[PDB]
Design a protein around this ligand. Structure first.
Ligand SMILES: CCCCCCCCCCCCCCCCCC(=O)OC[C@H](COP(=O)([O-])OCC(O)COP(=O)([O-])OC[C@@H](COC(=O)CCCCCCCCCCCCCCCCC)OC(=O)CCCCCCCCCCCCCCCCC)OC(=O)CCCCCCCCCCCCCCCCC
Ligand SMILES: Nc1nc2c(ncn2[C@H]2C[C@H](O)[C@@H](COP(=O)(O)OP(=O)(O)OP(=O)(O)O)O2)c(=O)[nH]1
Lengths: 188, 118, 151, 368, 114
């Protein structure tokens, strides 16, 4: 509900992406699910890990604006042709109505994973505490987003019926992580 | 003239007597080049005479087939077209020479993998 | 040869192609001590860990026939087995443990093992049994102890 | 394909040959006379080629006799230096300027390095080209196949061999290719090509057997030169034509017998290639409709003058092939005032022709 | 200890060395196509390493006939990969991704068991 919640039709507004503060004040440390599963099992094989707290975070930190730009480059949904553009979610009240309507109408599960509870998850920036063990303590070797995400989004690519010749789509530029010092400035 | 050969993709032959005569004539020339003691030269040279004369001896293809047996005249040609290829090819291999490769030890032994007591 | 047309392929082939067509007929020399481990396709892990025991299969003590020990054999190491959790069968992850091949002499067996990169070690060939007298009359001896008290 | 023994007798034409030497065959002639009605199993083109002095001529004559094929003697410069009335143009050369002096095979074997060699090689290509077209007219109008000694397709080998020995220059080779490219594409490739592979040492011996004055005395027929021709026939010509024409190779049918060769040809089948439409083998001669037959017949019977006007490719940066203006005037004077060159052939009264007052006719596919 | 034998493809180690490099060319040219036409996680740089990693496996091979066979088999896979006869699963089979690492140190193996 993270790489699909941002690739779904509902999340957009005809081509757009309402992000809180354009996502520039949100910093996240997404972790590949397999690494998390490896952590759970490794914690299960070991008794030393009993009765302790573990934080499962990725190796790098990214601004939410930086990530979403990178997806839409991987998805070939670039602004130049496709028409992608980032609102500031505070400006448009239409979006909050969609979630409120969406939650009410659907009996089983919200469509596109969109509902006001999910919105608040997006806004809050990950706060990895210092001194609490991480999966590296459990021996897991974390996979970077660049390794995995480009293969996750292959079935969500736009204009996927093209049969492009080799080179007709240029490899997207990788995302730029946020340095620890930069987070201080980004948050004033 | 046969209406049809009876075999798909095999056409009735015009002047089979000529076509056979040329082919047998060609074979004897290719065979002639082979050394006299070669057993292949002795057999085909003997054989092709037995086929060649029957081709000239008989003028009716139906009578020819009985005189030679060994299939229809169309097939007789098909056969003859081969020994040209064999005889020509075999002037290059020189099979009459001695055994090219002496057999290895136990290379034709059956059943295999038994201790042999000297 | 004879008049009959020449083969276009060889007749028209450039002198260079005929030359390499010759040395590919070749008969070049190569050393006879070779290792076929790369092409045999065995996983590399097995080739490094598992020994091969050249041996004659042991005669069945409970029988007098022998024609089932007239070969040399190879059997791999006896890796682990374990009870199957569900039904309790014997289970193993040891494909080569199932294996067995027959040979005529240890020299061939070593030759085969070297050509495939296996590590081997030969059990001592049973020395030919010493001659035994096995006389019947001695069962009834005048002053010797060989006299049998039964019959 | 069907020798006299196979047919048991002489060729029986399907219909009377069209008198292509005397009557033109334009579009309006094609309405009443159709082309396909005359084509037999023997309506094919055969090129009997080989190295220098391999007895091609003798083999062709015998071969063309068995298959009831028309035989076309190999072109020579006598076709340029002997007019119809028989006068020898070469006698006029003392008058002509040196650049326009007559040049022949004799001269090539004796002064191969002379600048007129480049001229001489292009003439041979032009002569073969015209002769080759004449064979096609005979094929298409009579239905009888033709036997040629050397087609224009194989002529570039001699030019290329001469270039390697350095007789020609870069420019002359460049000019030759443009002519060949400009012209070769308009011909129909032969059905069958026969080659007589005489080894290099053999031909050198064989040349001395003819005991032709200039050849034995000459230096051109060296190992290098004769070797170059062998490499060129087999690597460039034969490898290329075999994509279209059936190819038979013999050591020397000139020294061998032809009756065995005819029996080899008849074994070759020419219909298996017909099945696939786009099959390269014998593609040129695959006409779907009767219109296509007539079009090809019209082109060679009625539009040959066009075919022989493509040799006009202007190239003057090459100094060897250019003929100076002052020479041209002098050469024009001598050449066209010779006995029989005053007028078109068949009109020069001083050569004995008569009735010119009441004569109005001119030949078809004739000059001028 | 030498014997006369029939060559496979080449007559000299230098020719064998020449053939092997061509196989490296064709693979190295082909990686960009394989990434596009197979739904697999691996990228060109990762794959181009896998090509280097494995050509190194057969580092100590000496016999020309063995090198010929490796190049015969090596070429066969490339045709089966230049074509897409090999499916998505087979290409990733070159990485053994499913198999997790088995520790090599004695103490870890002992504790883990045989
Ligand atoms: C209308 C929404 C269409 C939803 C859709 O097309 O889903 C596919 C597709 C993907 O949906 P999804 O990501 O798999 O989400 C699964 C939902 O949970 C799928 O919903 P679910 O898992 O809760 O299962 C029940 C399912 C079906 O709904 C029902 O169970 C009740 C329908 C009773 C008949 O719910 C829906 O599909 C949503 C439709 C609710 C419309 C209710 C309108 C009522 C008036 C019409 C009667 O939707 C879209 O991508 C765009 C459609 C949005 C418009
Ligand atoms: N420079 C040049 N000489 C040619 C060419 N074609 C033929 N010749 C010359 C080479 C020899 O001096 C001489 C050989 O004549 P041929 O090989 O045509 O023999 P010919 O047709 O007279 O009878 P034969 O070949 O024995 O059946 O003509 C050509 O295209 N260029």
């Amino acid at each position: 509900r993270f790489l699909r919640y941002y690739a779904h039709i509902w999340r957009r507004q005809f081509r757009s992406m309402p992000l809180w503060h354009k996502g520039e004040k949100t910093v996240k440390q997404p972790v590949y699910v397999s690494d998390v599963a490896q952590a759970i099992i490794n914690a299960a094989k070991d008794p030393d890990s009993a009765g302790r707290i573990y934080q499962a975070v990725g190796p790098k930190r990214y601004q939410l604006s930086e990530l979403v730009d990178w997806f839409h480059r991987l998805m070939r949904k670039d602004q130049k042709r496709w028409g992608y553009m980032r609102y500031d979610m505070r400006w448009d009240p239409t979006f909050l109505l969609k979630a409120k309507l969406n939650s009410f109408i659907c009996p089983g599960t919200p469509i596109g994973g969109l509902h006001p509870a999910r919105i608040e998850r997006e806004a809050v920036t990950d706060k990895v505490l210092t001194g609490v063990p991480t999966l590296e303590d459990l021996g897991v070797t974390l996979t970077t987003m660049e390794q995995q995400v480009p293969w996750e989004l292959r079935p969500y690519r736009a204009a996927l019926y093209y049969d492009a010749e080799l080179g007709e789509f240029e490899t997207p530029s990788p995302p730029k992580c946020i340095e620890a010092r930069d987070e201080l400035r980004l948050f004033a | 003239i046969k209406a049809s050969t009876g075999l798909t993709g095999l056409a009735v032959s015009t002047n089979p007597h000529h076509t056979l005569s040329a082919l047998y004539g060609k074979i004897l020339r290719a065979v002639s080049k082979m050394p006299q003691d070669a057993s292949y030269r002795k057999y085909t040279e003997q054989l092709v005479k037995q086929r060649a004369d029957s081709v000239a001896q008989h003028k009716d293809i139906t009578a020819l087939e009985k005189a030679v047996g060994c299939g229809q005249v169309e097939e007789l040609i098909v056969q003859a077209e081969n020994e040209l290829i064999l005889a020509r090819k075999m002037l290059g291999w020189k099979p009459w020479e001695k055994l090219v490769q002496a057999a290895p030890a136990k290379q034709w032994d059956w059943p295999p993998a038994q201790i042999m007591e000297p | 040869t004879d008049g009959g047309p020449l083969d276009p392929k060889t007749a028209l082939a450039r002198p260079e192609e005929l030359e390499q067509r010759n040395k590919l007929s070749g008969k070049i020399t190569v050393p006879t001590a070779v290792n076929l481990s790369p092409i045999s396709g065995v996983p590399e892990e097995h080739i490094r860990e598992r020994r091969v025991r050249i041996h004659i299969p042991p005669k069945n003590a409970m029988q007098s026939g022998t024609d089932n020990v007239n070969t040399w054999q190879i059997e791999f190491d006896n890796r682990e087995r374990w009870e199957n959790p569900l039904m309790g069968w014997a289970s193993s992850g040891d494909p080569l443990s199932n294996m067995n091949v027959q040979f005529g002499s240890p020299e061939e067996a070593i030759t085969f093992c070297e050509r495939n990169g296996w590590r081997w070690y030969v059990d001592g060939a049973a020395k030919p049994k010493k001659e035994r007298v096995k006389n019947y009359g001695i069962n009834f001896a005048w002053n010797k102890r060989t006299r049998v008290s039964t019959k | 394909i069907s020798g006299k023994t196979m047919r048991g007798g002489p060729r029986v034409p399907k219909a009377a040959p069209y008198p292509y030497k005397t009557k033109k065959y334009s579009v309006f002639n094609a309405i009443f006379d159709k082309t396909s009605k005359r084509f037999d199993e023997n309506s094919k083109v055969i090129c009997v080629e080989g190295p220098i002095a391999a007895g091609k001529s003798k083999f062709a004559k015998e071969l063309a006799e068995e298959l009831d094929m028309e035989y076309y003697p190999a072109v020579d410069l006598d076709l340029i230096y002997i007019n119809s009335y028989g006068y020898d143009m070469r006698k006029l050369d003392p008058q002509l300027p040196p650049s326009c002096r007559s040049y022949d095979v004799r001269n090539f074997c004796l002064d191969p390095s002379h600048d007129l060699a480049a001229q001489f090689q292009i003439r041979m290509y032009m002569l073969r080209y015209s002769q080759y077209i004449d064979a096609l007219q005979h094929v298409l109008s009579t239905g009888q196949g033709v036997v040629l000694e050397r087609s224009p397709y194989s002529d570039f080998v001699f030019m290329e061999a001469m270039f390697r020995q350095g007789y020609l220059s870069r420019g002359a080779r460049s000019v030759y290719n443009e002519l060949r490219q400009n012209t070769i594409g308009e011909l129909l490739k032969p059905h069958l090509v026969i080659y007589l592979d005489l080894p290099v040492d053999a031909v050198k011996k064989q040349i001395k057997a003819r005991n032709v004055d200039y050849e034995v005395q000459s230096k051109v027929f060296s190992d290098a030169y004769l070797s170059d021709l062998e490499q060129l026939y087999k690597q460039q010509y034969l490898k290329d034509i075999s994509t279209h024409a059936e190819l038979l190779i013999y050591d020397w049918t000139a020294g061998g017998e032809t009756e065995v060769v005819v029996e080899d040809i008849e074994r070759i089948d020419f219909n298996q290639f017909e099945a696939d439409i786009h099959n390269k083998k014998m593609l040129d001669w695959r006409f779907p409709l009767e219109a296509e037959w007539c079009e090809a017949r019209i082109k060679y019977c009625h539009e040959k003058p066009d075919l022989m006007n493509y040799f006009n490719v202007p190239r003057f940066d090459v100094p060897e092939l250019v003929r100076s203006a002052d020479d041209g005037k002098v050469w024009r004077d001598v050449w066209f005032n010779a006995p029989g060159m005053k007028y078109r052939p068949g009109y020069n009264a001083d050569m004995g022709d008569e009735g010119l007052l009441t004569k109005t006719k001119i030949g078809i596919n004739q000059g001028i | 200890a030498v014997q006369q034998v029939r060559p496979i493809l080449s007559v000299d180690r230098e020719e064998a060395r020449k053939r092997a490099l061509n196989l490296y060319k064709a693979w190295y040219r082909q990686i960009p196509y394989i990434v596009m036409d197979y739904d697999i996680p691996m990228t060109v740089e990762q794959c181009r390493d896998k090509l280097r990693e494995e050509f190194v496996k057969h580092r100590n091979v000496t016999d020309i006939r063995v090198i010929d066979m490796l190049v015969i088999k090596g070429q066969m896979e490339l045709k089966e990969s230049v074509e897409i006869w090999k499916q998505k699963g087979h290409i990733m089979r070159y990485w053994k991704e499913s198999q997790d690492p088995k520790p090599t140190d004695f103490l870890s193996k002992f504790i883990q068991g045989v």
